[PDB]
Amino acid sequence: LKLDKENALDRAEQAEADKKAAEDRSKQLEDELVSLQKKLKGTEDE
Amino acid sequence: LKLDKENALDRAEQAEADKKAAEDRSKQLEDELVSLQKKLKGTEDE
């Protein structure tokens, strides 16, 4: 039914939204591995 | 619709696989951020 696709799609769509969120978390963490590494090196340089 | 529960379920498996890969990266990056933070603080306290 449309409801089985809608539910499976909600899982897929939400999973894509969760990928966006998971990607936002991981790209932000990578940006923050850079900020932490940069700040680590900021502190290492200091 | 009829096969979309299946296409969307497989899409969800893939979307979940990718939100998971992104989330696994978030966790790995979270561990690295934390490691960098511990090292940053190692260097900041230093």
Contact status, residue B32 vs residue A32, Cβ threshold 8 Å: no
Where do runs of H (alpha helix) occur along B1-46? Answer: 4-45
Give the minimum alpha-carbon distance from A36 to chain B in angstroms, rounded to a whole number: 6
Q: Closest chain A residue to B19 measured between Cα atoms?
A: A19
Is B30 in CB contact (< 8 Å) with chain A? Answer: yes
Q: What is the identity of the amino acid at A6?
A: E
**Is the Cβ–Cβ distance between B32 and A33 less than 8 Å?**
yes
How many Å from the N-terminal Cα to the C-terminal Cα in chain A?
Answer: 63
| 8 Å CB contact between A32 and B30 | no
- Between the alpha carbon of residue B5 and those of residues A25, A40, B8, the distances in Å are 28, 48, 5
Which residues are CB-neighbours of A1 under 8 A, at least 6 positions away?
Answer: B1, B2, B5
- Method by which the coordinates were obtained: cryo-EM
